[PDB]
């Protein structure tokens, strides 16, 4: 999800964009600014929430030894979903 600054310069996923009066925009004249179009925050928000009937779940990121260190998430808070913070993956207990 790329966004355009008021000076016509693309804004990166870190919010970086030179100011209007910043002289450092001269480096992009007759050239281009390297911006990655895919936003990890947007993609992980697009990812859904997995419902599992357990108080504690485990996430290793998928792939086993090719993922991240296996961690355990406690799904007791019913006001929010438990997020594995290695891969930003949300898990939840079945309500209703």
């Amino acid at each position: 999800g790329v966004r355009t600054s008021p000076t016509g310069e693309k804004v990166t996923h870190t919010g970086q964009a030179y100011d209007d009066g910043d002289y450092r925009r001269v480096r992009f004249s007759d050239r281009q600014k390297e911006v990655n179009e895919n936003f990890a925050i947007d993609l992980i928000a697009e990812q859904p929430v997995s419902e599992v009937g357990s108080r504690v779940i485990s996430c290793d990121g998928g792939g086993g030894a090719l993922g991240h260190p296996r961690v355990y998430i406690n799904l007791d808070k019913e006001t929010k979903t438990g997020t594995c913070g290695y891969c930003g993956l949300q898990f939840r207990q079945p309500h209703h």
Partner: protein
């Protein structure tokens, strides 16, 4: 200069073309390796040794690993030691190919250079297969080796070793009995045994002078006490004898390579001590102790007990030594690198007495100087 290896300033006084004195000016490839090592950790300083004698790279790595393991009071597994010796002999083949072919190119012959450099290309392929880097592997590490061999490496090494003696024979068909090569090399740069010992020569220089001394035989390391090989011995202490010694050392290293291929044992590749060598990726991602040890080893590094050691190996260019001083921290306090070529280049002036310009070129070639290790 084509014959100066790139970073040597040889200030020479010549009466006509006869050499009156040689004054080697070195330091044009001095980088401050030892100071940088002081600023690095033990794992971060390994590529420095990888880049010291950049023709015997796994040999430098093995010497550094032996020093660090001696300080740590640990022991590599037998499979790691066998892989170390196998790749040390492969590196010796690489180094001797480079030395002999560059010597012959400085004399005037280039066809053996091209042939044996194709062979060097195949050995570079072996290096890249094990490590991912063609020459600067950083593969041999204190505690063992970084990774295990792929599942075809031994067979490909066997094929290479099977087809290499013919290449050595072809190299000898152009040089050994050629009268021009004999005129260029015979009775050039003659050094007596006592002078070699006093000046501090090591390896092929001593053996050409006739000294029966080899570190792999007298002070064995890794599994060099389990392999059989012969040590070439010179008679006249000249360039021709040293060249013959290097060729025969290539053949004996082929012997050792065959023995290592047959005697490669099973087991792990590094000391089973997660406070020195990192755990496996699966253990790190499933075990809390393994994750903690991975974190600490790759951020701070393992502590080494205080003490100073001097460990030397028979690198392809002579005795390569490390004087390592540890103050108990995770970074070395001092690391002095004894390069074999330093003493040889110091002795260049004496060996060139009463000779000419081409003779001095031949003497440089037979000394086989790497200024990376000379200057550090």
């Amino acid at each position: 200069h084509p014959a100066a290896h790139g970073v040597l300033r040889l200030v020479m006084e010549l009466s006509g073309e006869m050499v009156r004195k040689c004054d080697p000016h070195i330091g044009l490839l001095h980088r401050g390796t030892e100071k940088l090592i002081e600023y690095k950790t033990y794992l971060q300083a390994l590529p420095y040794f990888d880049r010291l004698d950049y023709v015997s790279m796994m040999c430098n790595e093995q010497a550094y690993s032996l020093a660090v393991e001696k300080l740590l009071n640990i022991q590599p597994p037998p499979r790691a030691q066998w892989i170390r010796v196998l790749f040390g002999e492969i590196t010796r083949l690489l180094n001797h190919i480079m030395a002999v072919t560059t010597h012959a190119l400085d004399i005037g012959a280039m066809t053996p250079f091209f042939w044996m450099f194709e062979e060097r290309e195949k050995m570079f392929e072996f290096y890249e297969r094990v490590s991912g880097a063609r020459m600067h592997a950083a593969y041999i590490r204190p505690g063992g080796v970084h990774q295990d061999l792929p599942l075809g490496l031994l067979d490909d090494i066997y094929e290479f070793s099977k087809n290499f003696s013919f290449r050595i024979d072809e190299l000898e068909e152009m040089l050994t009995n050629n009268r021009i090569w004999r005129n260029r090399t015979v009775d050039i740069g003659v050094v007596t045994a006592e002078d070699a010992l006093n000046y501090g020569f090591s390896g092929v220089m001593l053996r050409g002078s006739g000294i029966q001394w080899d570190l792999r035989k007298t002070q064995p390391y890794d599994v060099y006490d389990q392999v059989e090989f012969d040590v070439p011995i010179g008679s006249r202490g000249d360039c021709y004898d040293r060249y013959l010694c290097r060729v025969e050392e290539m053949r004996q290293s082929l012997r050792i390579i065959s023995q290592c291929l047959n005697k490669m044992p099973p087991g792990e590749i590094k000391v089973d001590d997660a406070k020195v060598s990192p755990p496996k990726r699966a253990e790190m991602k499933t075990s809390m102790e393994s994750l903690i040890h991975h974190f600490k080893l790759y951020t701070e590094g393992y502590q080494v007990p205080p003490g100073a050691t001097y460990t030397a190996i028979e690198a392809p260019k002579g005795e390569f030594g490390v004087y390592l001083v540890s103050d108990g921290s995770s970074r070395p306090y001092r690391c002095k690198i004894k390069a074999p070529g330093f003493a040889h280049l110091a002795g260049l002036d004496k060996m060139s007495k009463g000779h000419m310009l081409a003779d001095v070129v031949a003497i440089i070639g037979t000394q086989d100087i790497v200024f990376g290790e000379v200057d550090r």
